[PDB]
Design a protein around this ligand. Sequence first.
Ligand code: HEC
Ligand code: HEC
Ligand code: HEC
Ligand code: HEC
Length: 107
Amino acid sequence: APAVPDKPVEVKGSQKTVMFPHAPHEKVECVTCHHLVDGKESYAKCGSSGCHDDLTAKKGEKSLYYVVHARGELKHTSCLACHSKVVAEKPELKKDLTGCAKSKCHP
Ligand code: HEC
Ligand code: HEC
Ligand code: HEC
Ligand code: HEC
């Protein structure tokens, strides 16, 4: 694989950018997030062309918002899906990991 980013990286939506830190995710398998595509590894940006390249819609597979924020049933684990499980076990982190405002994603 390519080297994991060693600093927070931009995740660009259509109007907001959220910084994503790899370090707290070191125990998460890369493929949880960088899931296989057509049975092959890929580490391309989630919003690249042909992937989750609808940066304005809130719903549906092509939506970057949806694959980040859906709490619902998805074929891969979303940020908010996993974080909901983490905060169940570490409730002190509820706002940090799941808040829509004043969270670590949206400070
Ligand atoms: C989800 C919790 C992740 C885990 C686990 C890993 N990465 Fe990641 N990575 C993730 C995101 C949301 C992003 C930003 C993507 C975007 O569209 O902006 C990244 C980015 C990278 C990159 C750079 C991609 C690019 O700019 O072309 C690389 C090379 C990368 N990630 C590698 C990587 C590896 C090797 C991991 C396991 C050691 C790994 N990531 C875990 C989300 C997540
Ligand atoms: C294009 C090569 C992609 C890249 C890069 C990323 N994703 Fe993706 N994703 C892609 C497809 C073709 C699909 C549908 C088939 C499948 O593998 O399930 C998905 C699916 C997801 C999902 C589930 C969506 C749903 O069930 O509606 C999630 C949560 C998801 N992808 C997340 C995700 C993230 C966070 C990515 C960057 C780290 C990412 N994908 C890259 C195609 C592609
Ligand atoms: C589980 C499979 C995860 C997925 C998918 C994502 N995150 Fe996560 N995140 C996870 C853990 C276990 C932790 C650490 C909690 C703890 O016990 O401390 C985190 C933490 C973050 C943070 C906070 C980091 C800090 O400020 O100290 C951020 C900003 C964060 N995660 C963002 C994030 C995003 C944007 C994700 C989807 C692209 C995402 N996480 C996925 C576990 C998991
Ligand atoms: C980190 C785990 C996040 C938490 C908690 C919340 N959001 Fe978020 N949000 C996150 C990312 C990685 C991004 C950028 C990628 C994308 O387009 O989704 C965003 C962006 C938004 C936006 C702007 C969308 C755009 O196209 O610019 C909105 C309006 C937004 N987020 C809403 C939102 C709400 C309502 C939240 C509480 C449920 C929330 N976010 C939490 C990552 C994270």
